[PDB]
Structure 1
């Protein structure tokens, strides 16, 4: 059984994967739910405070409870077949040990100094463990309706320069040993295995790198630990042995939760997308160094297309399409990368903002540039093989010629320059957080034409690429467009009260898409502007999943088609209706567009799903 934000709960039999239960509503948004030990009941926690224990078979309500001063944190039926109790944590910090055989609570239990994080009955029904943000375990004596034991948790020792003394551990999951005789837990940067019966620490499984745990899950089999540290980092660790077994890429939205089968042979994976992925236990252990890194740059030189990649462990590997030809390289984790014009070189940024340009002919030859307060942002090369150009936290736009080691700067006096692009001339287009659409010069810094198209930041600005005849931008205000000849845009489109978020020019035509936040596109003729039929690519959908963001538009060479890419690719026919809408991406959330000069093949990698290559046939 899974609930949701709607607060309806749906109960299902996983095998045949077919609806086995529909529940009409739960008052207030569901907070959590759970089966009875004999699966004869289903408790349902909620913000309302209506502990609705519906029958698991008839589906009709049986038990119901309320006592909490605040919203319930957790509900669970007694693991014992005999005793019928309902331990319930809540934001009011008070535990409520319900007697399921009675309408009123068997025992209120103040104890936690912070709101309860999780709650479970102990295999010994006489005992009742509990957890909370203070992090200390609390093994209550339910039989006496009184405190018995409560391990302190400062075991995550960490002597930082932090003014706070010993760290205040915040345990989340209340994991149990398969016998339940001891309590596995996890918090911050470390898993622990406390022995509540002796009231002392035993195990301590450190998590990957350092941060603060968002989710964790012990596995009684194989001493496994499926832990979602942060950003859906659902690694498969191995407890006690204290070493990772294997990586598990594949949830979008950063997981929302995971739990193993009672057999332990499988586990569910609830996620923010609204998705639950079943998984076999065996598959996770095996290694699978795949699924390229989420953001990459690909450069297309004809018949074979090469995609930029970040190594699964360290730097990078270049894998050409239609081949197994890996091209690994070494560096202390490159921040970003860029190939030189007319090939012959390769380059990368750094966390310090330093930017090396390794030669292809010889690994010994390189130039390293030290610049920028932080990691370098945008990087672009001149039409000449020489002269690096870059930007970052600095207000200035860096122009560092390599070999010559020249350091020309674009002194824009901005808080920072957000991004910049090459113009067909010696001019260098740019824009910052003040939303100025500056027109500088390449190599030599010189702000020749200056535009203030937006008081706010330039959200997405696209330049057409035939001559320098036009350029346009939209930034949650107006879709301005100019020919550079004027200091102000030739037209200021105002056809969208919801304000256009992004725009892209036609492939040497007269079309000009204007993307909305909801993925809506409004095509505009490159002639001041006129009420052209909106491309209107998405009309009916909802908040389902993999849909947010109007990242890019890829016009067909014919110009008769727009390749919209938000939650998934859809080839919306230009002006009214759609052409080849179909597709549907596995990853979702593509953020980049690459097109071959021919325009035959575009491959998208979205959400780290992987890179997908398309090659239409006859």
Structure 2
């Protein structure tokens, strides 16, 4: 036989903590986001992840692109500024600030970089990366920094309630006084003639270079953390702790409010052609909007381990289930479609109905929940006495099976009425699957067995042979072969009489998940050893998918059999093809 090698194609992930800043490359093709998760991530125009910049040892507060878009700078709470290339390699680490670095900017010629710090200073560095100047003195921490379009003026925003304007020799040109509290952000208009400042006092102020106050933007109900001018200089965007972005004209009129973030908004940026807006939030997401107030896309991912994954029978949707208490729905292009919120503890399992319109989730909160594709909670299934570890839909789409630490499998209708309990396991049940025969169910248990049942509740067969917990189970497409995944480091293949047909050996730690391809020719297994392995039916290893940075807990095939999705405690789902 022949197995064509598959490769990693999409990464279903994003930041796992607050996003502090966003920036666009000069051509508008790339977005950089900076996070408390200690990383910067680079995204294409479709919101697909291109690269992660790893290396900072504390939260990243600012990010900027060079004028040609080939160098990224980042500013961190770790007291360093780092300069990177687009392959994610470190060019330079710049040290000298005595406290957190809160903001970073490149000069228009990109030969100079400016950094703003809690240490009350702004520092100017060359690309190589010698310190050129220290700008003193604000009387408190400096939170924002910007260059004028000609690069001859630097603006800094400070907790001392002022914005200061400086030349490149560190001479103070002007102080903008008037905010009644900390200034968190500053921006220049495109023509360099107007300065905007965002303040803890709930306002944005617009100034000229003489320090005269041209206009105050009032309407936010809390601190304004970020501000930006549109490329045409006619619109101002503001990002607020009130969870909104507001768009204004120069007369102070409110044009639009962008609602959708669920926590404070920290940063806002216009794409250089002015056709989209990006915002960064404490809700751990970046949101992309058009110039009409509509949400285009959310850059989001799980904030903790991903324990389960499922592919829709429609072939276009993937669901991931996470310790972060959410289920996320994604398309096959790696774009987020929807987040399902409401469980009060970890989600261990997820499944699609045969028509792809309903999602079921199994949770440590002891419930199964049913949802629609728009994210609406439709029903809670209550009855298990402990954590729910696995869930599946029948081929007819009207029965839901759940497996629990309470040693049972339960069968339910969509109104959450209990149709049947399957009792017989002597320990926790971690996996459950329906046969395509539309008659039988399989369960996998910590008691080291798989059990096969009729849907009327009768135990038909026990599969004995594993020497440790069994946590995954799957049927072949013809329903005649069962596969089980175990803590004993093997996958086993069985017939419906409980005869062992084959043992798949190779993983070097617990096997948490298994699935058969739709053509039944390929088996995939997910392991604590951080790999997915691909096998044929003779028990032969065909390929080892390496790429996850921690345990892999779940695997699923697309309906056409061409794509595999894997879920890991590295907080991501990967698509392979």
What is the TM-score of this pair, normalised by structure 2?
0.48
Ranked by relative contact order (alpha carbons within 8 Å, sequence separation 6 or more), the top structure is 2
- Which one has the bigger strand percentage? 2
What is the TM-score of this pair, normalised by structure 1?
0.46
